[PDB]
């Protein structure tokens, strides 16, 4: 028994759709520090025309900058952020902007796929695979927004 | 006590983005930071203080 704005968490994506979303997100893992460093060293050695890279967006400030621009297509939100005020308004912002959002249990689990110890949120803007993203978005909507 | 709250504002989707400052050119151009890092690595290689990974593979012997 808490205010409606609270307890919107504890209702989350089911195991199957959550696993599917994690599998889809793992494809766009950003180049870790070691991989980027070695690739840059290789490029410099070769020097001693380029496609736009694709990666997931996870910075809370960066994600919020992408959110409200309607560029973000799907956003994942951790339900165990200690400063809950950082994420209480994010679902409402996404709903107002019409951007589908999914609450996934575990900030550590969210961060494990972006080479970070923890990550409050994760969002996707570009895609490689658009049909898979659309199907995942539809499934997430039908299983989360229409239910809760 | 915890009465339901009405989504009197979120019930209508935002038609247009709120932000401004149209897209910078860098978003449509390869990053300049990458070029700076590549040129720094090139300078280091010229100074002989960085070994290319291909040469590192040979030195692994």
């Amino acid at each position: 028994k808490v205010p409606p704005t609270i307890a919107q968490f504890q209702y989350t994506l089911d195991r199957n759709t959550a696993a599917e979303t994690f599998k889809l997100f793992n494809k766009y893992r950003p180049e870790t520090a070691a991989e980027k460093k070695e690739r840059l060293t290789k490029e410099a050695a070769a020097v001693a025309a380029s496609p736009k890279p694709y990666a997931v967006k996870y910075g809370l400030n960066h994600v919020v900058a992408l959110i409200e621009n309607k560029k973000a297509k799907l956003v994942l939100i951790a339900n165990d952020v200690d400063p809950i005020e950082l994420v209480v308004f994010l679902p409402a912002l996404c709903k107002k902007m019409g951007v589908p959002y999914a609450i996934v249990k575990g900030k550590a689990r969210l961060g494990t796929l972006v080479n970070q110890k923890t990550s409050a949120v994760a969002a996707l803007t570009e895609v490689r695979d658009e049909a898979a993203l659309a199907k995942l978005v539809s499934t997430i909507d039908a299983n989360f927004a229409d239910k809760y | 006590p915890y009465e339901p709250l009405i989504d009197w504002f979120t019930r209508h989707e935002e038609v247009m983005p709120l932000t401004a400052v149209p897209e910078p050119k860098r978003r449509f151009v390869p990053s300049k930071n990458e070029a700076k890092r590549v040129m720094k690595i090139v300078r280091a290689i010229r100074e002989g203080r960085i070994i290319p990974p291909k040469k590192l593979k040979e030195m692994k012997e």
Partner: peptide, 24 residues
């Protein structure tokens, strides 16, 4: 600023009414 007004309205809807405001 339109963005500031939008943020204020969003916060108003999220926070609901204060206990003293609820008296109205």
């Amino acid at each position: 600023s339109n963005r500031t007004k939008f943020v204020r309205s969003l916060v108003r809807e999220i926070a609901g009414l204060s206990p003293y405001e609820r008296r109205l």
